[PDB]
């Protein structure tokens, strides 16, 4: 009815052991199943009946549990194992299936502060009648990073969206962009546009700004 998975994210290096857990709100009559899912691909059955490996699933994958506690274990991580894992439950009746919210297994790596850049809206876009201010955080690790927009010292809330790349195939870092949207009219009403970034690799927040 409710499957709670933990942790939400697991940062490991290839060769280490991964332990994911899933907890049901009530004793499940049927042992859980586990799935692996890579971005933009169908889920793949790994374990069913709490401990049985599905077809073609290698030995390093194992599971156990009973009652309300189930766990998935990957004895030694291989590069292809970094993905998202879901636990799943289903009764005979009602027949609906329930899914955990997923655990993301990510590649650990040394700390790397982001290189920050700010881009003012292009004159070309301003003709268009819109303004997009872009803040880029390049090649950082770990994932958690906080971006804060300020226009003439006023904290911007609800008018920005951000996007993050997948862990880089080569250096395992992330890159993120935050886009602040403003009407051209308002853009022209202010002077200082600033992007303040807070991250582990930075001893104190970094701010990039420009003057309209």
């Amino acid at each position: 009815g409710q499957l709670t998975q933990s942790p939400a994210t697991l940062s490991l290096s290839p060769g280490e052991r991964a332990t994911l857990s899933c907890r049901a709100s009530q004793s499940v009559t049927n042992y859980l199943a586990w799935y692996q899912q890579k971005p933009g691909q169908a889920p793949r059955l790994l374990i069913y009946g709490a401990s049985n490996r599905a077809t073609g699933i290698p030995a390093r994958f194992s599971g156990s549990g009973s009652g309300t506690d189930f766990t998935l274990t990957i004895s030694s991580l291989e590069p292809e194992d970094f993905a998202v894992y879901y636990c799943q439950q289903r009764d005979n009746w009602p027949p609906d299936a329930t899914f955990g919210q997923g655990t993301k297994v990510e590649i650990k790596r040394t700390v790397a502060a982001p290189s920050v850049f700010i881009f003012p809206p292009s004159d070309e876009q301003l003709k268009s009648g819109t303004a997009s201010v872009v803040c880029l955080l390049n090649n950082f690790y770990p994932r958690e990073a906080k971006v804060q927009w300020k226009v003439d010292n006023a904290l911007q809330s609800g008018n920005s969206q951000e996007s993050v790349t997948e862990q880089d195939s080569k250096d395992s870092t992330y890159s993120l962009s935050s886009t602040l949207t403003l009407s051209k009219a308002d853009y022209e009403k202010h002077k200082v546009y600033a992007c303040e970034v807070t991250h582990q690799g930075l001893r104190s927040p970094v701010t990039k700004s420009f003057n309209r």
Partner: protein
């Protein structure tokens, strides 16, 4: 040996209908209950509906009751999902899944997924604006529907390039940035749904 192939997805406006198909092969279709499971953008897996092996009993997630109808045709080994009165919130990738042979409370085989996009937005090509160790890029803004592809210098520049995942803006149109950290730099943008190609040299 076992295979599930889907089709039927598409971009549609709210209130319209769509009908999904999932053709099975490699196993005795008539013996398994079949299901539809979806995954909205950036979300986890969410169960939608089930139809018993003989097609007589069905069950639906509360969010789709009265709007969607799951059915199957065993003669043709096909599973269907009739989706009426579509809403923007239905937007997601829809997968069909087969109840396990070894364990029926698990899903042993899945369709590759079919995309259901519900939006009152219309097809539109993007506008490409310049974003000017240094960094530069292209802001590929206000297009619909997904996807658009971006490459740099006709694919001759790849090192140090980051093309971010698209973002759905409040206007219903998508937007994405492609940057590169570093001689001429041109982003080659292509949005097939609108037959829109643009080579934008960033100065």
């Amino acid at each position: 040996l076992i295979n599930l192939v889907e089709s039927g997805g598409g971009v549609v406006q709210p209130g319209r209908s769509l009908r999904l198909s999932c053709a099975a092969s490699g196993f005795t279709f008539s013996r398994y209950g079949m299901h539809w499971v979806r995954q909205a953008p950036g979300k986890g897996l969410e169960w939608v509906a089930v139809v018993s092996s003989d097609g007589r009993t069905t069950y639906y997630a509360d969010s789709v009751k009265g709007r969607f109808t799951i059915s199957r045709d065993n003669s043709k080994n096909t599973l269907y999902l009739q989706m009426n009165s579509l809403r923007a919130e239905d937007t997601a990738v829809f997968y069909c899944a087969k109840e396990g042979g070894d364990n029926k409370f698990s899903f042993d085989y899945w369709g590759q997924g079919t995309l259901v996009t519900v939006s009152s937005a219309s097809t539109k090509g993007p506008s490409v604006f310049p974003l000017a160790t240094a960094a530069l890029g292209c802001l590929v803004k206000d297009y619909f529907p997904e996807p658009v592809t971006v490459s740099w210098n006709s694919g001759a520049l790849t090192s140090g390039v980051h093309t971010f995942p698209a973002v759905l803006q409040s206007s219903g149109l998508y937007s994405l940035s492609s940057v590169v950290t570093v001689q001429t730099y041109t982003c080659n943008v292509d949005h097939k749904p609108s037959n829109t190609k643009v080579d934008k040299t960033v100065e």
